[PDB]
Design a protein around this ligand. Structure first.
Ligand code: NA
Length: 321
């Protein structure tokens, strides 16, 4: 029998336990095969607080593809549904083992609670902003990052549910575009990715209940670290707002605002592109210091150069603003 890891997190100060379940792609030809989480490199600490996700794991066979994980309700049949509007989501993260061209992602999508066919325990029904038909839905990329760069993105789609038209580029910010010393793997950076830090995201609503602002802050060494003010259309912005989204060539927050009312699934996906330059949008050119079109950045080479590449997430908390 499959033994899904239990991840304990905090919802308005109360200890909630969710199950961790891996995507159907990893479950063999039926897509409903059992997962050995030790073999896919997915570990929760004894205290239930820390999730370790490895890119490459060798046991009696070799996991070379990291993992896409969903938070599953304790019922073991439905995804753990969240509505982040008027909430803040915070987690502690160790990014120190994530080189250029890897993507440690923690995000939400408007997947159906039951997945494809009331079978969420098998990690079915995935959708995101890059999909088509049943594979297309609103995507809130809270976290897509390595030790060298990070991006926050809202991908509004209309209509909501599956199969809408999506902003594939998203309303997004990467602090490197404004300040190349904000985020990186030494004490020379405002956020030192060689050491653990807290990622805080506020999903601010208006009186009417519409999502109006997405605010990113970091905490490290007890210091609260705001994101650099970003220039778009000659104006400075300190958060994702409809004005910023418009000015920066993204779609506004409105599609996402409607979508979050349906409930989202929390996705934890550690991945690398099979193509050289597949992650350059995140961490190369004006988005980060990483080598562009790096053949060594392709998954198969990355896992050979950095066989211990992994992410740790701790103390996931969702709190009402
Ligand atoms: Na660069």
């Amino acid at each position: 029998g499959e033994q899904r890891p239990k991840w304990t997190w905090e919802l308005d100060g109360k200890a909630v336990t969710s199950l961790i379940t891996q995507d159907t792609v990893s479950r063999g030809t039926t897509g409903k095969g059992d997962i050995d989480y030790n073999a896919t490199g997915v570990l929760v600490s004894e205290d239930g607080k820390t999730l370790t996700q490895r890119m490459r794991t060798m046991t009696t066979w070799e996991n070379k593809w990291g993992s896409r994980l969903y938070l599953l309700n304790a019922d073991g049949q439905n995804y753990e549904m969240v509505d982040l509007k008027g909430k803040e989501l915070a987690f502690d993260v160790d990014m120190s083992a994530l080189p250029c061209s890897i993507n440690a992602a923690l995000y939400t999508v408007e997947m159906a609670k039951g997945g494809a066919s009331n079978d969420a325990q098998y990690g079915t029904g995935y959708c995101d902003a890059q999909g088509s038909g049943s594979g297309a839905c609103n995507e809130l990329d809270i976290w897509e990052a390595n030790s060298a760069a990070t991006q926050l993105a809202v991908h509004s789609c209309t209509p909501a549910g599956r199969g809408g038209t999506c902003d594939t580029g998203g309303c997004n910010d990467n602090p490197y575009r404004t300040d190349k010393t904000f985020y990186g793997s030494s004490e020379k950076f405002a956020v030192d990715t060689s050491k653990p830090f807290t990622v805080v995201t506020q999903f601010v609503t208006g009186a009417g209940g519409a999502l109006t602002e997405v605010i990113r802050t970091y905490v490290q060494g007890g210091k609260t670290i705001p994101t650099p003010a970003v220039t778009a259309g000659g104006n400075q912005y300190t958060s994702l707002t409809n004005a910023y989204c418009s000015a920066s060539g993204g779609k506004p927050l409105d599609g996402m605002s409607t979508s979050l009312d349906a409930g989202h699934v929390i996705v934890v996906s550690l991945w690398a592109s099979d193509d050289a330059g597949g992650m350059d949008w995140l961490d190369s050119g004006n988005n980060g210091p990483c080598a562009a079109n790096d053949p060594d950045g392709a998954r198969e080479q990355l896992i050979k150069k950095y066989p211990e590449a992994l992410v740790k997430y701790s103390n996931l908390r969702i709190t009402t603003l």
